[PDB]
Design a protein around this ligand. Structure first.
Ligand SMILES: Nc1nc2c(ncn2[C@@H]2O[C@H](COP(=O)(O)OP(=O)(O)OP(=O)(O)O)[C@@H](O)[C@H]2O)c(=O)[nH]1
Ligand SMILES: [Mg+2]
Ligand code: NA
Length: 343
């Protein structure tokens, strides 16, 4: 059960204080404009985007020029979350689902109250994480090269920008120390297993994003439990219940482990008790496009974990957000399964 056909795409949740750039970072990677469409310019829902490893390899090429860094994951599911204070429930749900995370910190502001909240979530679950120290283009006099690696661009800055960067970096490290986290600028980190790496980024210029992407793959491959690199028993969670044109009442689901198939008999929790139904359509967005955004869906016979899927099935009207979802297998009893989800 440790073969290429059995590889699992892990889950990375992005967390941070409001307006720190979490969505803008993902828009730069995806080449989308989700943030410009958001009411108030704020995220109000959990979003999910799947990144195939081919795309991650291309977007890290400028910090892997000789092609030698070994990519072992087949891809990565990235869960976007709200930073606004009123959405603590959704940060908790996203954090609960992830295997690794990116914590976004505005380099201009340092740690802020929902950063502290997010650090509590990360500590509680022992989640490996990297920090995107974002908005470096706001360093006064920053000269950009679009989508460059951070070190190459940093070497081209004037002495004032380099000094400002180091002063802000040192302040942020002291703040993380006050919260009980040792942190290092990523290329100064000699203990990747225990110290938090700080990777400076700009979602506007793209700089440092190649470093950030390489680092989250390294988190998957070198800090996450190895067993999570491979598919095991199905695990899935309902995110939302949504009525959709043509498909009727659907559920959006994070498939955390295992494999879902069209036609599967599924059991989940409903307002009046267990719901048992069959998957009529098993849908995803296009790769590198958001689950939380209306678009044309791709229909699949099979979806391997992790992914964000939309399921069309009769009888989903009472489904409960946060419910687990099970599949009735050949040796399962359908009625016995209903209780298991129940408790
Ligand atoms: N100058 C600069 N502005 C940025 C950067 N990243 C984000 N912004 C701006 O900061 C504002 C907030 O960006 P968002 O992507 O909404 O941040 P967020 O963390 O997703 O916000 P919530 O999901 O609402 O918590 C927007 O106006 C962005 O254009 C950056 O690297 N540099
Ligand atoms: Mg956002
Ligand atoms: Na925002």
């Amino acid at each position: 059960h440790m073969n290429k056909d059995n590889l699992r795409s892990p889950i990375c949740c992005i967390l941070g204080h409001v307006d720190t750039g979490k969505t803008k970072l993902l828009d730069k990677i995806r080449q989308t404009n989700v943030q410009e469409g958001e009411a108030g310019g704020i995220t109000q829902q959990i979003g999910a985007t799947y990144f195939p490893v081919e795309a991650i390899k291309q977007k890290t090429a400028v910090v892997n020029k000789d092609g030698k860094f070994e990519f072992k994951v087949p891809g990565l599911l990235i869960i976007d979350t709200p930073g606004h204070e009123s959405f603590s429930n959704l940060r908790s749900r996203g954090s609960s689902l992830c295997n690794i995370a990116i914590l976004v910190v505005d380099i201009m502001h340092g740690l802020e109250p929902q950063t502290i909240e997010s650090l509590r979530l990360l500590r509680e679950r022992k989640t490996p994480f990297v920090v995107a120290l974002n908005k470096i283009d706001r360093l006064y006099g920053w000269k950009k090269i679009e989508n460059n690696g951070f070190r190459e661009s940093f070497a081209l800055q004037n002495k004032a920008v380099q000094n400002e960067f180091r002063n802000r970096l040192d302040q942020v490290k002291l703040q993380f120390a006050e919260q009980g986290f040792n942190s290092e600028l990523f290329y100064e980190n000699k203990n990747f297993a225990r110290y938090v790496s700080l990777v400076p980024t700009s979602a506007h210029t793209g700089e440092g994003i190649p470093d950030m992407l390489k680092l989250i793959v390294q988190l998957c491959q070198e800090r996450m439990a190895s067993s999570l690199m491979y598919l095991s028993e199905l695990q899935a969670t309902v995110l939302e219940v949504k009525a959709i044109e043509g498909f009727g009442v659907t559920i959006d689901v994070i498939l955390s482990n295992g494999i879902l198939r069209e036609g599967d008999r599924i059991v989940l929790c409903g307002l009046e008790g267990p719901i048992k139904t069959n998957i009529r359509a098993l849908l995803t967005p296009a790769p590198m496009r958001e689950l939380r955004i209306k678009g044309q869906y791709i229909h699949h016979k099979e979806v391997k974990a992790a992914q964000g899927v939309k399921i069309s099935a009769p009888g989903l009207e009472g489904a409960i957000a946060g419910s687990r979802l099970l599949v009735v297998g050949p040796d399962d009893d359908e009625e016995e399964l209903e209780e298991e989800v129940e408790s």
